Amino acid sequence: STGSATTTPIDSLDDAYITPVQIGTPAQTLNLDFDTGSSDLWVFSSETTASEVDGQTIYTPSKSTTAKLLSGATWSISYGDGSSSSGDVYTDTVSVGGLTVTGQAVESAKKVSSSFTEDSTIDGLLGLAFSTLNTVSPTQQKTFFDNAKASLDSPVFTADLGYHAPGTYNFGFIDTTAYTGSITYTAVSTKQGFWEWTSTGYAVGSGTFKSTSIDGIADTGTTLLYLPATVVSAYWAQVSGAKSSSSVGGYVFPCSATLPSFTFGVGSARIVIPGDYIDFGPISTGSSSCFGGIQSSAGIGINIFGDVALKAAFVVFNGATTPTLGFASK
């Protein structure tokens, strides 16, 4: 089997991408944030505290003839940005782009933190990291990809995120028309439960490539590119007037600036992030200070190749017995 679904930016900045997912019988379609940095499929639901729902579409398990309470199971998750959610668990039929999994754990939120409530466009998350990170207790549950894997034509999924435009998540096949050149594959460590890999270096604009190992994670659920402070300083030094602002929470730059590109290495190959992709717009409405899309990871504990980086590439998440990542230009 295969599946193919369009993913759409939630706003004009590409802050996140939503993909429609069919849950239950008859189908209830929710727009989920596919997150290669986590491993829970959780949804706003008929059980979510009413004051914490503000415009989201909810899953109502009592209206699904295939839903079953997973007795005793609870979940609770906290994300790198400080947001969180928790609740109980149902199993139900879940379909993405024509690919169907029966018996998928659907984690129903009883509580969500304010950042989720305040974003009416995201109805939940669909985790695509390794199932060892799934938070369901006392019996850990498998991700949608893990459950689908054996049925897929090939045990892979691909992320093709758009810049200010829709893109595609495919399951079970690699669309050879969706990229240019060849795909360069690189080794993955699953020791932390992430799609963790080592970039071979970087360049700023037309500058020389610096060969240096940068370990990090491929995370579709993080907006920006978080890298070591040395690398980030070298980037913003090429933008007149750019500076790190403790009050704003990162590097800002004059909105009148033209930003240089940023290249990262994948083995001997190179992925170029155009300068435009690094502009996240005014810090507040009407401001002439703009927020940068490359930020320091120093306070995180891990480097994160988020959407800023991933949307410059066609990305293969190869879930074979020994997983690997592939990157192609597009």
From Swiss-Prot:
**According to its UniProt record, which reaction does this protein catalyse?**
Hydrolysis of proteins with specificity similar to that of pepsin A, prefers hydrophobic residues at P1 and P1', but does not cleave 14-Ala-|-Leu-15 in the B chain of insulin or Z-Glu-Tyr. Clots milk
Biological process GO terms, please?
A: proteolysis
EC number(s)?
Answer: 3.4.23.22
What is the enzyme's main class?
A: hydrolase
What are the positions of the active site?
35, 199
Covalent S-S links between cysteines: 255-290
Q: Which UniProt keywords apply?
A: Aspartyl protease, Disulfide bond, Hydrolase, Protease, Signal, Zymogen
UniProt-recorded Gene Ontology molecular function terms: aspartic-type endopeptidase activity
Record-annotated Peptidase A1 domain positions: 17-328
Q: Which domain of life is it from?
A: Eukaryota
Q: What family is this?
A: Belongs to the peptidase A1 family.
* Protein name (database record): Endothiapepsin
Provide the species name.
Cryphonectria parasitica (Chestnut blight fungus)
**Species classification:** Eukaryota, Fungi, Dikarya, Ascomycota, Pezizomycotina
Q: Which gene encodes it?
A: EAPA
Q: Which residues of the full protein are shown?
A: 90 to 419 of 419
